[PDB]
Design a protein around this ligand. Structure first.
Ligand SMILES: O=P(O)(O)O[C@@H]1[C@@H](OP(=O)(O)O)[C@H](OP(=O)(O)O)[C@@H](O)[C@@H](OP(=O)(O)O)[C@H]1OP(=O)(O)O
Ligand SMILES: O=P(O)(O)O[C@@H]1[C@@H](OP(=O)(O)O)[C@H](OP(=O)(O)O)[C@@H](O)[C@@H](OP(=O)(O)O)[C@H]1OP(=O)(O)O
Ligand SMILES: O=P(O)(O)O[C@@H]1[C@@H](OP(=O)(O)O)[C@H](OP(=O)(O)O)[C@@H](O)[C@@H](OP(=O)(O)O)[C@H]1OP(=O)(O)O
Lengths: 394, 393
């Protein structure tokens, strides 16, 4: 996975991943998608279509105005859709799971899927379920979607306090200062604009952030276009750093968020344990529980489990880039899997996969990546209570 | 450079470019000459036998000559700290002076200990001379010898550990990993004619010996490369075997039942003590330094539980993914605890491994800065975990 791929952050595409378990517990962000709003593509368009009128585009400028006009037609009626690469990212995840754990899904295995009400959550579910059903049509499948799992998969919109922190919160003054410190527009304008001076300093940054925006998502759409040549590997690096810091402060352990963005996910960590505990006892015959949602679900959820490095509390804004990497945690199609195993002697082992790679918890095990479930369920129970007590503050 | 990392614990120290009141340090000595003529001897005898039999390739002969010259260049040098060794210490020292000059200012007192092995006495000397160069007013105490065996050479004093290290149950595991990972005849096709006449046992002993020679040459300051003797895939495969061996006999592999790690608690206990004394006012050192060996740093780091450096990996083919000896014990590998005293007078501590902030499985709100109380408590827990481990042996 290349540096420029990584600098896409949460817009990065899901990377390459070319005994038996008895239960699998899963949460997945939808795969590669289209841009969700024409906001960025329009700021770019109206600036460039201004300069052209005034006869003030560079040659590369008309180049960019071309593509942009193209991408406008290629994005028509597609806003928010999951992309063909998303369909593929999900079929691969599920395909791999089925090759890895065939016994788990053989015969009349019962599985269960939930998704938010959001069309591309549901298109993910369907992508996932199709592969499984075509590999084994004798699966038993419960499929469901809707506002009802909002408290589980969109808790980040139900918490009045978080909502307020996120809109007019304290991380904002730190993010704006960081953007001005890390991103100089004036070297990027004159690439496309004759006389970039008469553009306001504020509008220049509005334009250059929209431009990074348009470029960064472009690889997730499966369109042959590609605008990474727009920027030097260092512009992409500085830009990534302002967004890695935005994801981190609005959405994870940034000490400015006082743990509030992480705590709001305990309803989901709890359904995760419920789901499992029900299978380990017998109030559920489910081989699997799949859940499809969003980056805003995954990020706080991953931090609340305390998967190593994701819970890090870092006080210097420029250090965060070193210890917290959002393309590590929440690429496109980012997924958490718990795989439960019952060994000879009847003891339970859980293995946690972040994006199909073994995760570490700050609890012991003489059998890594396999942790004792007793230990784990207790550890997570510590985290949940420790989140309810931060939310009590609010 | 991936080739550099595959030297494993022979990889030269990587590139490294408010104020604490105390530094607690432990350093592996710098890049050194090979400590034994044994790999060089094996290689030579095999190619001398080849050429006495007309079994040598063109490149075969060019390796024989190379090997002969190296035997002359290693005469009397076995084990000595190399010029690059002196330098990397000067670096580590230089960088800690500049980052923390208030701590070494005025007549700061610093204490340095080394083990009786000359290469780690020279390492000390190089570190310390830079420190005195920059501030001659430093109060310096410098000692070394068998007196420190209990904390710098514990991998020799434990009777159970030595048995394990020489005939323990990691040996078959290792010997079969090398059998699967290392495929000789593609590597000796380059140096010998009819390389498939060589018995598999001797074929591996020579390719092992010959890797081991090209692994160390970059530490000797001898302007003579040898990575192109092996493809990058042979270096990988070879690194994995050496990485398994180091992990399994020196660190926290299940096969070893934490015994390779437990034997390091005297070192950890004394770190905390030297820090409690400075913190209490009993001592008033600015810094303690200690110069030992990878066999010291490996188990000491794992015993601290620095992140993933003590994973206990069930399956041997997975060890390279989760535990990398070149990240832990490069040449002149080192651990620093820097102690800070904030405005409420609480004591923070930041742990550096090879000069980069390490993570403890405890929690903190101002990472990399851990609460000392929380950290002292956690370490003492490990130290009692290791004592319980050593009472079952
Ligand atoms: O791609 P996602 O769904 O995992 O995260 C989106 C986020 O989506 P949503 O869950 O609030 O509908 C928001 O989308 P909208 O409110 O515009 O519908 C965010 O705005 C969007 O950020 P963006 O509009 O700058 O692309 C999130 O994607 P992100 O987490 O990569 O920033
Ligand atoms: O922190 P690690 O060493 O356990 O994993 C690194 C990875 O290191 P390596 O084992 O290939 O030397 C690479 O490091 P470099 O080749 O840049 O020296 C990866 O690039 C690095 O990803 P990053 O550059 O985005 O930090 C790995 O860290 P990661 O597993 O947290 O992504
Ligand atoms: O390089 P070090 O000193 O930090 O560790 C050595 C180890 O040396 P020592 O601590 O027992 O004196 C052993 O050396 P000797 O008993 O031959 O003096 C090991 O044999 C040596 O391994 P090697 O013979 O394959 O070079 C250790 O270095 P290593 O940790 O890179 O393997």
């Amino acid at each position: 996975q290349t540096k420029i791929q990584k600098y896409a952050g949460t817009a990065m595409p899901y990377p390459n991943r070319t005994m038996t378990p008895f239960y699998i517990n899963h949460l997945g962000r939808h795969g590669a998608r289209f841009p969700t709003s024409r906001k960025a593509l329009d700021k770019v368009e109206k600036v460039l279509v201004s300069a052209q009128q005034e006869n003030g585009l560079t040659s590369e400028g008309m180049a960019l105005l071309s593509m942009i006009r193209r991408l406008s037609r290629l994005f028509d009626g597609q806003w928010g859709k999951l992309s063909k690469l998303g369909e593929t990212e999900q079929e691969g995840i599920a395909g791999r799971m089925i090759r890895n754990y065939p016994q788990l899904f053989s015969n009349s295995a019962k599985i269960e899927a939930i998704a938010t009400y959001v069309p591309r959550s549901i298109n993910s579910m369907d992508a996932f379920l199709s592969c499984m059903i075509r590999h084994n049509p004798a699966l038993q499948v419960q499929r469901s979607e809707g506002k009802q799992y909002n408290h589980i998969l969109r808790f980040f919109d139900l918490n009045k306090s978080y909502v307020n922190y996120k809109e007019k919160g304290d991380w904002l003054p730190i993010y704006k200062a960081f953007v001005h410190k890390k991103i100089s527009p004036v070297p990027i304008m004159k690439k496309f604009l004759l006389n970039p001076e008469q553009y306001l300093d504020k509008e220049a940054e509005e334009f250059v952030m929209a431009l990074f925006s348009v470029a960064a998502i472009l690889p997730d759409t499966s369109i042959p276009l590609n605008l990474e040549d727009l920027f030097t590997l260092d512009e992409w690096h500085r830009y990534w750093q302002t967004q890695n810091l935005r994801q981190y402060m609005s959405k994870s352990s940034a000490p400015v968020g006082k743990m509030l963005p992480v705590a709001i996910a305990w309803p989901l960590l709890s359904e995760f344990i419920r789901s499992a505990q029900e299978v380990i006892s017998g109030k559920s015959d489910y081989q699997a529980n799949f859940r499809f949602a969003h980056a805003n679900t995954v990020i706080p959820f991953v931090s609340l489990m305390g998967i190593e490095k994701t819970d890090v509390q870092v006080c210097r804004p420029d250090s965060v880039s070193v210890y917290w990497k959002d393309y590590e945690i929440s690429p496109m199609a980012a997924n958490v899997q718990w795989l439960f195993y019952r060994d000879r002697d009847q003891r339970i082992w859980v293995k946690i996969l972040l994006n199909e790679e073994a995760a570490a918890l700050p609890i012991s095990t003489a059998c890594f990546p396999y942790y004792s479930w007793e230990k784990t369920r207790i550890f997570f129970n510590q985290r949940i209570e420790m989140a309810k007590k931060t939310l009590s503050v609010f």
